[PDB]
Write a protein that binds this ligand. Structure first.
Ligand code: HEM
Ligand code: EPM
Length: 458
C-alpha cells in the first residue's frame, strides 16, 4: 500500500538543492508540483522535506494532533532577526503561547473598531497622492501599496509615523527589510553558507538587522516620551500580562515582536493589494462589479467601519487574489509522531512537510477545472468552501493572528481606490512576480483617472 514518492531532477551530491538557485524558488516549486503531482520529496545535503499540493493530503497535514508548525529553513534564517517573536517561535517555546495570549486582544473586534480611524488616515494620504498626480504621470503600484501598509501598521500598532508618502524612495526600514528577506531567500540554496565568498552578504545582513533595530529603538523611545495615552499593540506588548502565567513579555521578546509585526504586519498586505489591483485591471467586468459596489456602499466622505464590512464583493475580490497568489506562499509542518500520510506515505516522528499554498489553491478536484480564472464569485459563500481547501493565512493555533486586520485594511483601501478613480493598465503589464520569501508583482504600473469625488477630512 506504500508508494514511492516522486522527486525532481538531481545534481549529484547537491541532490535537489540547485533547483532553488533561482530568484523565483516558489514559482519553480509550483512548476515541479505541476509535473510531479500532489506530493514530492526534495532533498538537500543533510536534509529532506516533502512538498504537498493537494487538499486531500494538506487536510491531513493540518490535523494539529498529528502535525505542528515547523520552522522552514527560510524561517530559521528570518529568526536571525525575528528571534522568538510570534512568527518564528516554536509552538513549544514558552514565549509563543505567552505572546499569543498577550497580543490576541489587540486583534479583537473592539480593537479593529479602534484602529479604523488611523487606517483611514493613511488611506486618505494614498488617495490624495493619486489625486495630485499630473496627467502625464502614472502609479507604481507595489511601491505605493508598501507605503500604505507599512504606514498603517506603524500608526495603528505603534503610534509611529513612517511618513512613507513623504518619500520618493523606499523608507530605509523597507530597504533593509527587503535586503534581509532577499538574503534569507538566497541563502536557501547555498550548500556551503560559510565560504568566505559570502562574507559581504553576512556583513550587509548584519547592517540591515541594525537598521531595523535602530528603528525599533525610536519606536520604543517615542512611546516613552509620549504624554498621550495610547492603547494599541505596543501598549499590550509593553504592559500586557499573559493570563496563564501572569507574566508580561520581557524586553528582548518585545523587540522581536515589534520587528515581527512591522514585517508580517505589512509586507504580505502590500502584496495582496498589488495582486488584487492587477487582477482587477486584467478583468474589466470584475473591476466594474467592484467599482459599482464601492460607489454604492461608500456614500460618505470617508468610510465608516460598518461600511467597510458591507463591501462584500471587494472582500470576494481580495479572497480570490489570495487564492491565486497567497503572498506568504508556504508554511511548514513536522510530524509529532510516526504516522501515515494519505494512507500511502509513512512518516517518522520529526519528518517535515511544506505546504505549497498556490498549488493547494489550484486543486481542480476542489475548485473546478477553471482554477486559473479570476472569479471572485467562488467566494460568494466562504463558509461553503471545504475545510483546508483555502489557507492563505496558515493553520490552526499557528494561523495568522492579523488576518482580520489585513483584510479590513485591504478592503477599506481597495474600496476607496475604486470609489475615487478609474484605472488603466496603460502598458498592458506582463505579470512578473518578485520573490523575497513573500510574493509581490514587480514593475506593475497603472494610470488612474480621478472621478473627482471630494474626500472627507481626517
Ligand atoms: C493578506 C496578508 C497576510 C497574509 C497572507 C498572512 C499570512 C500568514 C501565514 C500563512 C501565517 C502562518 C505562517 C506559518 O505557518 O509559518 C501567518 C502568521 C502570522 N501573521 Fe500573518 N498574514 C497576513 C497579514 C498579517 C498582518 C497584517 C499581521 C499583523 C497585524 C500578521 C501577523 C502574523 C503573525 C504575528 C503570525 C504568527 C502567528 C503565530 O504563529 O502565533 N499577518 N500569516
Ligand atoms: C517575523 C516576520 C517574518 C516574515 C517572513 C514571512 C515568510 C513567508 C514564507 C514564505 C515561504 C518561503 C518559501 C521558501 C521556498 C522553500 O520551499 N524553502 C524551503 C526549502 C527547503 S530545501 C533547503 C525551506 O525554507 O525550508
Amino acid at each position: 500500500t506504500i508508494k514511492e514518492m516522486p522527486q525532481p531532477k538531481t545534481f549529484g551530491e547537491l541532490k535537489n538543492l540547485p533547483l532553488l538557485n533561482t530568484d523565483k524558488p516558489v514559482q519553480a516549486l509550483m512548476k515541479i508540483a505541476d509535473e510531479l503531482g500532489e506530493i514530492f520529496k526534495f532533498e538537500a545535503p543533510g536534509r529532506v522535506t516533502r512538498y504537498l499540493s493537494s487538499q486531500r493530503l494538506i487536510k491531513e497535514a493540518c490535523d494539529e494532533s498529528r502535525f505542528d508548525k515547523n520552522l522552514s529553513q527560510a524561517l530559521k534564517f528570518v529568526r536571525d532577526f525575528a528571534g522568538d517573536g510570534l512568527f518564528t517561535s516554536w509552538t513549544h517555546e514558552k514565549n509563543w503561547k505567552k505572546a499569543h495570549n498577550i497580543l490576541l486582544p489587540s486583534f479583537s473586534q473592539q480593537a479593529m473598531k479602534g484602529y479604523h480611524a488611523m487606517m483611514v488616515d493613511i488611506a486618505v494620504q494614498l488617495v490624495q497622492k493619486w489625486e495630485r498626480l499630473n496627467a502625464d504621470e502614472h502609479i507604481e503600484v507595489p511601491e505605493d501599496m508598501t507605503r500604505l501598509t507599512l504606514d498603517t501598521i506603524g500608526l495603528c500598532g505603534f503610534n509611529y509615523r513612517f511618513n512613507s508618502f513623504y518619500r520618493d524612495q523606499p523608507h530605509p526600514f523597507i530597504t533593509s527589510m527587503v535586503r534581509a528577506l532577499d538574503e534569507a531567500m538566497n541563502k536557501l540554496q547555498r550548500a556551503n553558507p560559510d565560504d568566505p565568498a559570502y562574507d559581504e552578504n553576512k556583513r550587509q545582513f548584519q547592517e540591515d538587522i541594525k537598521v531595523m533595530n535602530d528603528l525599533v529603538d525610536k519606536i520604543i523611545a517615542d512611546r516613552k516620551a509620549s504624554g498621550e495615552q495610547s492603547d494599541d499593540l505596543l501598549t499590550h506588548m509593553l504592559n500586557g500580562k499573559d493570563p496563564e502565567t501572569g507574566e508580561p513579555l520581557d524586553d528582548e521578546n518585545i523587540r522581536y515582536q515589534i520587528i515581527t509585526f512591522l514585517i508580517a504586519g505589512h509586507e504580505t498586505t502590500s502584496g495582496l493589494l498589488s495582486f488584487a489591483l492587477y487582477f482587477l485591471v486584467k478583468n474589466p467586468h470584475v473591476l466594474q462589479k467592484a467599482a459599482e459596489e464601492a460607489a454604492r456602499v461608500l456614500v460618505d466622505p470617508v468610510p465608516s467601519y460598518k461600511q467597510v464590512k458591507q463591501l462584500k464583493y471587494v472582500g470576494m475580490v481580495l479572497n480570490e487574489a489570495l487564492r491565486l497568489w497567497p503572498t506568504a506562499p508556504a508554511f511548514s509542518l513536522y510530524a509529532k509522531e510516526d504516522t501515515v500520510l494519505g494512507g500511502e506515505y509513512p512518516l517518522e516522528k520529526g519528518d517535515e512537510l511544506m505546504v505549497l499554498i498556490p498549488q493547494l489553491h489550484r486543486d481542480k478536484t476542489i475548485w473546478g477545472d477553471d482554477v486559473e480564472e479570476f472569479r471572485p464569485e467562488r467566494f460568494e459563500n466562504p463558509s461553503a468552501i471545504p475545510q483546508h481547501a483555502f489557507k492563505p493565512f496558515g493553520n490552526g493555533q499557528r494561523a495568522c493572528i492579523g488576518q482580520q486586520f489585513a483584510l479590513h485594511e485591504a478592503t477599506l483601501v481597495l474600496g476607496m481606490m475604486l470609489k475615487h478613480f478609474d484605472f488603466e493598465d496603460h502598458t498592458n503589464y506582463e505579470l512578473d512576480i518578485k520573490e523575497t520569501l513573500t510574493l509581490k508583482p514587480e514593475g506593475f504600473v497603472v494610470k488612474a483617472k480621478s472621478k473627482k469625488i471630494p474626500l472627507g477630512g481626517i
